[PDB]
């Protein structure tokens, strides 16, 4: 279930690296990168290859679990939303 796995990421250590990413006047609640979720998922029993963890994470955001951050991801979901989740460090994805 996508809801179960997502909740696992929202955990403490078992999940991703929940870290408050602050900038100027905004505090990105647990802001990370796209390639991050891929490495975490791959490190777990969910997926093995980078491709497997990439498609799984794709659904996650597609459902609205994740939240895109930056102009990169904002442009990806603008035109062709065929590929919402980006496995690049340039694209941000917080909770």
Short mmCIF file of N, CA, C and O in Angstrom, two decimals:
data_model
loop_
_atom_site.label_atom_id
_atom_site.label_comp_id
_atom_site.label_asym_id
_atom_site.label_seq_id
_atom_site.Cartn_x
_atom_site.Cartn_y
_atom_site.Cartn_z
N UNK A 1 0.83 -1.20 0.00
CA UNK A 1 0.00 0.00 0.00
C UNK A 1 0.87 1.25 0.00
O UNK A 1 1.86 1.33 0.73
N UNK A 2 0.49 2.23 -0.82
CA UNK A 2 1.24 3.48 -0.92
C UNK A 2 1.13 4.28 0.38
O UNK A 2 2.07 4.98 0.76
N UNK A 3 -0.01 4.16 1.05
CA UNK A 3 -0.21 4.88 2.30
C UNK A 3 0.69 4.37 3.41
O UNK A 3 1.19 5.16 4.21
N UNK A 4 0.88 3.06 3.46
CA UNK A 4 1.72 2.45 4.48
C UNK A 4 3.18 2.85 4.30
O UNK A 4 3.81 3.33 5.24
N UNK A 5 3.70 2.66 3.09
CA UNK A 5 5.08 3.01 2.79
C UNK A 5 5.34 4.49 3.08
O UNK A 5 6.34 4.84 3.70
N UNK A 6 4.43 5.34 2.63
CA UNK A 6 4.55 6.78 2.85
C UNK A 6 4.69 7.07 4.34
O UNK A 6 5.55 7.86 4.75
N UNK A 7 3.85 6.44 5.14
CA UNK A 7 3.86 6.62 6.58
C UNK A 7 5.20 6.19 7.17
O UNK A 7 5.68 6.76 8.15
N UNK A 8 5.81 5.18 6.55
CA UNK A 8 7.10 4.68 7.01
C UNK A 8 8.17 5.75 6.82
O UNK A 8 9.08 5.88 7.64
N UNK A 9 8.05 6.51 5.74
CA UNK A 9 8.99 7.58 5.44
C UNK A 9 8.81 8.73 6.43
O UNK A 9 9.77 9.44 6.75
N UNK A 10 7.58 8.90 6.91
CA UNK A 10 7.27 9.96 7.86
C UNK A 10 7.74 9.60 9.26
O UNK A 10 7.63 10.40 10.19
N UNK A 11 8.26 8.38 9.41
CA UNK A 11 8.75 7.91 10.70
C UNK A 11 9.98 8.69 11.15
O UNK A 11 10.32 9.72 10.56
N UNK A 12 10.63 8.21 12.20
CA UNK A 12 11.82 8.87 12.73
C UNK A 12 13.07 8.48 11.95
O UNK A 12 13.46 9.16 11.00
N UNK A 13 13.70 7.38 12.35
CA UNK A 13 14.91 6.90 11.69
C UNK A 13 14.58 5.93 10.56
O UNK A 13 15.27 5.88 9.55
N UNK A 14 13.52 5.16 10.75
CA UNK A 14 13.09 4.18 9.76
C UNK A 14 12.78 4.84 8.42
O UNK A 14 12.99 4.24 7.36
N UNK A 15 12.28 6.07 8.47
CA UNK A 15 11.94 6.78 7.25
C UNK A 15 13.09 7.60 6.71
O UNK A 15 14.25 7.39 7.08
N UNK A 16 12.77 8.54 5.83
CA UNK A 16 13.77 9.41 5.22
C UNK A 16 14.43 10.31 6.27
O UNK A 16 14.15 10.19 7.46
N UNK A 17 15.30 11.20 5.82
CA UNK A 17 15.99 12.12 6.72
C UNK A 17 15.17 13.38 6.96
O UNK A 17 15.47 14.44 6.41
N UNK A 18 14.14 13.25 7.78
CA UNK A 18 13.26 14.37 8.10
C UNK A 18 14.05 15.53 8.70
O UNK A 18 14.44 15.49 9.87
N UNK A 19 14.29 16.55 7.89
CA UNK A 19 15.04 17.73 8.33
C UNK A 19 14.36 19.01 7.89
O UNK A 19 14.00 19.16 6.72
N UNK A 20 14.19 19.94 8.82
CA UNK A 20 13.56 21.23 8.53
C UNK A 20 14.50 22.11 7.70
O UNK A 20 15.54 22.56 8.19
N UNK A 21 14.13 22.35 6.45
CA UNK A 21 14.94 23.17 5.55
C UNK A 21 14.44 24.61 5.53
O UNK A 21 13.47 24.93 4.84
N UNK A 22 15.10 25.48 6.29
CA UNK A 22 14.72 26.88 6.36
C UNK A 22 15.54 27.71 5.37
O UNK A 22 16.65 27.32 4.99
N UNK A 23 14.99 28.85 4.96
CA UNK A 23 15.67 29.73 4.01
C UNK A 23 15.72 31.16 4.53
O UNK A 23 16.69 31.56 5.17
N UNK A 24 14.67 31.93 4.25
CA UNK A 24 14.60 33.32 4.69
C UNK A 24 13.42 33.54 5.64
O UNK A 24 13.61 33.83 6.82
N UNK A 25 12.21 33.40 5.11
CA UNK A 25 11.00 33.59 5.90
C UNK A 25 10.10 32.36 5.81
O UNK A 25 8.99 32.36 6.34
N UNK A 26 10.59 31.32 5.14
CA UNK A 26 9.83 30.09 4.98
C UNK A 26 10.60 28.89 5.54
O UNK A 26 11.83 28.84 5.45
N UNK A 27 9.87 27.93 6.10
CA UNK A 27 10.49 26.74 6.66
C UNK A 27 9.96 25.48 5.99
O UNK A 27 8.94 24.92 6.39
N UNK A 28 10.67 25.02 4.96
CA UNK A 28 10.28 23.82 4.23
C UNK A 28 10.30 22.61 5.15
O UNK A 28 11.36 22.07 5.46
N UNK A 29 9.12 22.19 5.59
CA UNK A 29 9.00 21.04 6.48
C UNK A 29 9.52 19.77 5.81
O UNK A 29 8.89 19.23 4.90
N UNK A 30 10.67 19.30 6.29
CA UNK A 30 11.29 18.09 5.76
C UNK A 30 11.48 18.18 4.24
O UNK A 30 10.82 17.47 3.48
N UNK A 31 12.38 19.06 3.81
CA UNK A 31 12.66 19.23 2.39
C UNK A 31 13.88 18.42 1.99
O UNK A 31 14.96 18.57 2.56
N UNK A 32 13.70 17.54 1.01
CA UNK A 32 14.79 16.69 0.54
C UNK A 32 14.88 16.71 -0.98
O UNK A 32 14.23 17.52 -1.63
N UNK A 33 15.68 15.80 -1.53
CA UNK A 33 15.84 15.72 -2.98
C UNK A 33 15.10 14.52 -3.55
O UNK A 33 14.63 13.66 -2.81
N UNK A 34 14.99 14.48 -4.87
CA UNK A 34 14.29 13.38 -5.53
C UNK A 34 15.08 12.09 -5.51
O UNK A 34 14.51 11.02 -5.30
N UNK A 35 16.38 12.19 -5.72
CA UNK A 35 17.25 11.01 -5.73
C UNK A 35 17.38 10.42 -4.33
O UNK A 35 17.84 9.29 -4.17
N UNK A 36 16.96 11.18 -3.33
CA UNK A 36 17.03 10.74 -1.94
C UNK A 36 16.06 9.59 -1.69
O UNK A 36 16.47 8.51 -1.25
N UNK A 37 14.79 9.82 -1.98
CA UNK A 37 13.75 8.81 -1.79
C UNK A 37 14.09 7.53 -2.53
O UNK A 37 13.73 6.43 -2.10
N UNK A 38 14.79 7.66 -3.66
CA UNK A 38 15.17 6.50 -4.45
C UNK A 38 16.20 5.65 -3.72
O UNK A 38 16.11 4.43 -3.71
N UNK A 39 17.19 6.31 -3.12
CA UNK A 39 18.24 5.61 -2.38
C UNK A 39 17.68 4.97 -1.11
O UNK A 39 18.08 3.87 -0.73
N UNK A 40 16.76 5.67 -0.46
CA UNK A 40 16.14 5.18 0.77
C UNK A 40 15.28 3.95 0.47
O UNK A 40 15.38 2.93 1.15
N UNK A 41 14.44 4.06 -0.55
CA UNK A 41 13.56 2.97 -0.95
C UNK A 41 14.39 1.75 -1.36
O UNK A 41 14.08 0.62 -0.98
N UNK A 42 15.44 2.01 -2.13
CA UNK A 42 16.32 0.95 -2.61
C UNK A 42 17.07 0.31 -1.44
O UNK A 42 17.37 -0.89 -1.47
N UNK A 43 17.35 1.10 -0.41
CA UNK A 43 18.05 0.60 0.77
C UNK A 43 17.14 -0.31 1.60
O UNK A 43 17.62 -1.15 2.36
N UNK A 44 15.84 -0.13 1.44
CA UNK A 44 14.86 -0.92 2.17
C UNK A 44 14.50 -2.19 1.40
O UNK A 44 15.23 -2.60 0.49
N UNK A 45 13.39 -2.81 1.77
CA UNK A 45 12.94 -4.04 1.11
C UNK A 45 11.88 -3.73 0.06
O UNK A 45 11.35 -4.65 -0.58
N UNK A 46 11.57 -2.45 -0.12
CA UNK A 46 10.57 -2.03 -1.09
C UNK A 46 11.07 -2.28 -2.52
O UNK A 46 10.41 -2.96 -3.31
N UNK A 47 12.23 -1.73 -2.83
CA UNK A 47 12.82 -1.89 -4.16
C UNK A 47 14.28 -2.31 -4.06
O UNK A 47 14.85 -2.37 -2.97
N UNK A 48 14.87 -2.61 -5.21
CA UNK A 48 16.26 -3.02 -5.27
C UNK A 48 17.04 -2.10 -6.20
O UNK A 48 18.03 -1.49 -5.81
N UNK A 49 16.58 -2.02 -7.45
CA UNK A 49 17.23 -1.17 -8.44
C UNK A 49 16.77 0.28 -8.31
O UNK A 49 15.76 0.56 -7.67
N UNK A 50 17.51 1.19 -8.94
CA UNK A 50 17.17 2.60 -8.91
C UNK A 50 15.91 2.86 -9.71
O UNK A 50 15.13 3.78 -9.41
N UNK A 51 15.69 2.05 -10.75
CA UNK A 51 14.52 2.19 -11.60
C UNK A 51 13.25 1.80 -10.84
O UNK A 51 12.21 2.44 -10.98
N UNK A 52 13.36 0.76 -10.02
CA UNK A 52 12.22 0.29 -9.24
C UNK A 52 11.81 1.34 -8.22
O UNK A 52 10.62 1.62 -8.05
N UNK A 53 12.79 1.92 -7.53
CA UNK A 53 12.50 2.93 -6.54
C UNK A 53 12.06 4.24 -7.16
O UNK A 53 11.44 5.07 -6.50
N UNK A 54 12.37 4.42 -8.44
CA UNK A 54 12.01 5.64 -9.15
C UNK A 54 10.53 5.64 -9.52
O UNK A 54 9.85 6.65 -9.38
N UNK A 55 10.03 4.49 -9.98
CA UNK A 55 8.63 4.37 -10.36
C UNK A 55 7.73 4.39 -9.13
O UNK A 55 6.65 4.99 -9.16
N UNK A 56 8.18 3.75 -8.06
CA UNK A 56 7.40 3.70 -6.82
C UNK A 56 7.24 5.11 -6.25
O UNK A 56 6.15 5.50 -5.85
N UNK A 57 8.33 5.86 -6.23
CA UNK A 57 8.30 7.23 -5.73
C UNK A 57 7.45 8.10 -6.64
O UNK A 57 6.84 9.08 -6.19
N UNK A 58 7.42 7.74 -7.92
CA UNK A 58 6.64 8.48 -8.90
C UNK A 58 5.17 8.49 -8.51
O UNK A 58 4.52 9.54 -8.51
N UNK A 59 4.65 7.32 -8.15
CA UNK A 59 3.26 7.19 -7.73
C UNK A 59 3.01 8.07 -6.52
O UNK A 59 2.08 8.86 -6.49
N UNK A 60 3.88 7.90 -5.52
CA UNK A 60 3.81 8.66 -4.27
C UNK A 60 3.39 10.11 -4.52
O UNK A 60 2.36 10.56 -4.02
N UNK A 61 4.20 10.83 -5.29
CA UNK A 61 3.93 12.23 -5.60
C UNK A 61 2.68 12.37 -6.47
O UNK A 61 1.92 13.32 -6.32
N UNK A 62 2.48 11.41 -7.38
CA UNK A 62 1.33 11.44 -8.27
C UNK A 62 0.02 11.44 -7.47
O UNK A 62 -0.97 12.02 -7.89
N UNK A 63 0.05 10.78 -6.31
CA UNK A 63 -1.12 10.71 -5.45
C UNK A 63 -1.28 12.00 -4.66
O UNK A 63 -2.37 12.33 -4.20
N UNK A 64 -0.17 12.72 -4.49
CA UNK A 64 -0.20 13.97 -3.75
C UNK A 64 0.45 13.84 -2.39
O UNK A 64 0.36 14.75 -1.56
N UNK A 65 1.12 12.71 -2.16
CA UNK A 65 1.80 12.46 -0.89
C UNK A 65 2.95 13.44 -0.69
O UNK A 65 3.09 14.04 0.38
N UNK A 66 3.76 13.61 -1.72
CA UNK A 66 4.90 14.51 -1.66
C UNK A 66 4.51 15.91 -2.13
O UNK A 66 3.39 16.13 -2.60
N UNK A 67 5.44 16.86 -2.00
CA UNK A 67 5.19 18.23 -2.41
C UNK A 67 6.41 18.81 -3.12
O UNK A 67 7.44 19.06 -2.50
N UNK A 68 6.31 19.04 -4.45
CA UNK A 68 7.42 19.58 -5.25
C UNK A 68 7.88 20.95 -4.76
O UNK A 68 7.09 21.75 -4.27
N UNK A 69 9.18 21.20 -4.89
CA UNK A 69 9.77 22.47 -4.47
C UNK A 69 10.81 22.95 -5.48
O UNK A 69 11.66 22.18 -5.93
N UNK A 70 10.72 24.23 -5.85
CA UNK A 70 11.66 24.78 -6.81
C UNK A 70 11.01 25.08 -8.14
O UNK A 70 9.83 24.77 -8.35
N UNK A 71 11.77 25.69 -9.05
CA UNK A 71 11.25 26.03 -10.37
C UNK A 71 11.36 24.85 -11.32
O UNK A 71 10.63 24.77 -12.31
N UNK A 72 12.26 23.92 -11.02
CA UNK A 72 12.46 22.74 -11.84
C UNK A 72 11.22 21.85 -11.83
O UNK A 72 10.60 21.63 -12.87
N UNK A 73 10.86 21.35 -10.65
CA UNK A 73 9.69 20.50 -10.51
C UNK A 73 8.42 21.24 -10.89
O UNK A 73 7.48 20.65 -11.42
N UNK A 74 8.40 22.54 -10.62
CA UNK A 74 7.24 23.37 -10.93
C UNK A 74 7.01 23.44 -12.44
O UNK A 74 5.89 23.64 -12.90
N UNK A 75 8.08 23.27 -13.20
CA UNK A 75 8.00 23.31 -14.66
C UNK A 75 7.66 21.93 -15.22
O UNK A 75 7.06 21.82 -16.29
N UNK A 76 8.03 20.89 -14.49
CA UNK A 76 7.76 19.52 -14.91
C UNK A 76 6.27 19.21 -14.87
O UNK A 76 5.73 18.56 -15.76
N UNK A 77 5.60 19.69 -13.82
CA UNK A 77 4.17 19.46 -13.65
C UNK A 77 3.36 20.50 -14.41
O UNK A 77 2.13 20.43 -14.46
N UNK A 78 4.05 21.47 -15.00
CA UNK A 78 3.39 22.53 -15.76
C UNK A 78 2.88 22.00 -17.10
O UNK A 78 1.67 21.91 -17.32
N UNK A 79 3.81 21.64 -17.98
CA UNK A 79 3.43 21.12 -19.28
C UNK A 79 3.11 19.64 -19.25
O UNK A 79 2.03 19.24 -18.81
N UNK A 80 4.06 18.82 -19.69
CA UNK A 80 3.87 17.37 -19.70
C UNK A 80 4.09 16.79 -18.31
O UNK A 80 5.23 16.71 -17.83
N UNK A 81 3.01 16.38 -17.67
CA UNK A 81 3.08 15.80 -16.33
C UNK A 81 3.31 14.29 -16.39
O UNK A 81 3.06 13.58 -15.42
N UNK A 82 3.80 13.82 -17.54
CA UNK A 82 4.07 12.40 -17.72
C UNK A 82 5.11 11.91 -16.72
O UNK A 82 5.09 10.75 -16.30
N UNK A 83 6.01 12.81 -16.34
CA UNK A 83 7.06 12.49 -15.38
C UNK A 83 7.12 13.54 -14.28
O UNK A 83 7.90 14.48 -14.36
N UNK A 84 6.28 13.39 -13.23
CA UNK A 84 6.25 14.34 -12.12
C UNK A 84 7.46 14.22 -11.20
O UNK A 84 8.12 15.21 -10.89
N UNK A 85 7.75 13.00 -10.77
CA UNK A 85 8.89 12.75 -9.89
C UNK A 85 10.20 12.77 -10.66
O UNK A 85 10.37 12.04 -11.64
N UNK A 86 11.13 13.62 -10.21
CA UNK A 86 12.43 13.74 -10.86
C UNK A 86 13.53 13.18 -9.97
O UNK A 86 13.65 13.55 -8.80
N UNK A 87 14.33 12.28 -10.53
CA UNK A 87 15.43 11.66 -9.79
C UNK A 87 16.69 12.53 -9.85
O UNK A 87 17.80 12.01 -10.00
N UNK A 88 16.51 13.84 -9.74
CA UNK A 88 17.63 14.77 -9.79
C UNK A 88 17.71 15.58 -8.49
O UNK A 88 16.70 15.88 -7.87
N UNK A 89 18.94 15.94 -8.07
CA UNK A 89 19.15 16.72 -6.84
C UNK A 89 18.68 18.16 -6.98
O UNK A 89 18.39 18.83 -5.99
N UNK A 90 18.60 18.64 -8.22
CA UNK A 90 18.17 20.00 -8.49
C UNK A 90 16.71 20.20 -8.10
O UNK A 90 16.31 21.29 -7.68
N UNK A 91 15.92 19.14 -8.22
CA UNK A 91 14.50 19.19 -7.87
C UNK A 91 14.30 18.82 -6.41
O UNK A 91 14.82 17.82 -5.92
N UNK A 92 13.53 19.65 -5.70
CA UNK A 92 13.26 19.42 -4.28
C UNK A 92 11.89 18.80 -4.07
O UNK A 92 10.97 19.00 -4.87
N UNK A 93 11.76 18.05 -2.98
CA UNK A 93 10.50 17.39 -2.63
C UNK A 93 10.39 17.26 -1.12
O UNK A 93 11.06 16.43 -0.51
N UNK A 94 9.53 18.08 -0.51
CA UNK A 94 9.34 18.04 0.94
C UNK A 94 8.01 17.39 1.30
O UNK A 94 7.25 16.98 0.42
N UNK A 95 7.73 17.30 2.60
CA UNK A 95 6.49 16.70 3.07
C UNK A 95 5.43 17.78 3.31
O UNK A 95 5.75 18.87 3.80
#
